[PDB]
């Protein structure tokens, strides 16, 4: 839940400070890359699957971005296309269609 995510964020901040203390670096300038290097040094793992090695990333990345329930206490969903079951995809399609309509109003090499 959202409160669980807040608790995880607080725990991650405290752990980041503790890891900066352990590695003897400034907690205020301890980037995510420093966190990863410190974790790899303190908890070495030769497992080939990188997703299986120890990780202490931000909760925004460790937890799936599917988020908690998509409605508040009142139960009203936040997104107006929620009942489509694919609110992200259909919102993206709606935005693209609006862009095409605006293009109608007004009027390959290094990418895949």
């Amino acid at each position: 839940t959202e409160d669980f995510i807040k608790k995880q964020i607080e725990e991650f901040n405290i752990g980041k400070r503790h890891l900066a203390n352990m590695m003897g670096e400034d907690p205020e300038t301890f980037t995510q890359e420093d966190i990863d290097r410190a974790i790899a040094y303190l908890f070495p793992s030769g497992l080939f699957e990188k997703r299986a090695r120890p990780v202490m990333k931000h909760p925004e990345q460790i937890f799936p971005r599917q988020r908690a329930i998509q409605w508040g206490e009142d139960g009203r969903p936040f997104h107006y296309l929620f009942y489509t079951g694919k609110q992200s995809y259909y919102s993206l399609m709606h935005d693209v269609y609006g862009m095409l309509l605006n293009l109608e109003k007004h009027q390959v090499i290094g990418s895949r």
């Binding site: 399609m93 693209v96 269609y97 095409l100």
Partner: protein
């Protein structure tokens, strides 16, 4: 008893015998004479003939209705005017 070289007669145009024969065969087929001869080679019993005629009539009616339906529905076979919705 009738006068000859009038019925089922096609004049050959510039020696094109094959085209004249094709025209004559098409005329006979359009008039159903070829199918008449093929059916008259052996006796078709009246019940069998009635069944065949009824089946042919039903098949023609169904084919005409299906053709009309396909022609009516193919008017919508165009580019999607509301793509992305």
């Amino acid at each position: 008893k009738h006068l000859k070289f009038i019925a089922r007669t096609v004049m050959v145009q510039e020696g094109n015998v094959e085209s004249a024969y094709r025209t004559l065969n098409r005329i006979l087929t359009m008039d159903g004479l070829i199918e008449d001869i093929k059916h008259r080679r052996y006796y078709e019993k009246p019940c069998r003939r009635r069944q065949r005629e009824s089946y042919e009539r039903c098949r023609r009616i169904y084919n005409m209705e299906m053709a009309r339906k396909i022609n009516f529905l193919m008017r919508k076979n165009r580019a999607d005017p509301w793509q992305g919705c």
